[PDB]
Amino acid sequence: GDVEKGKKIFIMKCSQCHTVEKGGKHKTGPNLHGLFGRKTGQAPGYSHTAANKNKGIIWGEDTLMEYLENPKKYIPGTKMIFVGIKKKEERADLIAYLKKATNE
Numbered sequence: 001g002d003v004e005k006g007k008k009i010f011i012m013k014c015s016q017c018h019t020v021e022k023g024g025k026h027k028t029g030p031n032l033h034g035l036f037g038r039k040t041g042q043a044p045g046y047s048h049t050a051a052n053k054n055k056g057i058i059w060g061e062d063t064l065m066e067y068l069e070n071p072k073k074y075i076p077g078t079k080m081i082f083v084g085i086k087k088k089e090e091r092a093d094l095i096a097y098l099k100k101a102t103n104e
């Protein structure tokens with residue numbers, strides 16, 4: 001994925017509710033630093049829904065590809081009110097940016 005394109009997707013569609021930087025603030029949604037390799041719903045200091053807490057999967061490229069295509073289908077009961085990203089290559093670019101920014 002192209003992380004420069006992914007960053008602009010993140011700004012356009014995600015930054016309204018999320019930060020990615022280490023120690024970044026929670027907003028409507030949790031700060032996302034440390035996302036990869038972590039189980040769902042464990043962002044430190046954020047009050048997740050039980051659904052987000054209980055999904056039980058580990059975030060990685062493949063699980064984020066599925067989640068971000070249709071969030072409420074993957075995690076029924078989520079309070080992330082976002083329709084999803086239809087195009088696979090856009091999701092791949094976003095997730096490549098996420099893998100870089102949430103670990104740097």
Ligand code: HEC
Nearest residue numbers: 013014017028029040041042043048049052078079080082
């Ligand atoms: C507000 C309207 C949001 C927008 C736009 C996006 N997200 Fe979000 N997200 C939001 C909330 C309120 C929550 C918590 C939901 C809950 O049920 O507790 C989330 C959660 C996530 C997560 C899960 C994190 C984890 O399990 O540790 C991820 C990975 C996530 N959101 C990603 C994400 C991306 C990449 C977005 C842009 C396309 C995006 N979200 C938009 C609220 C909102």
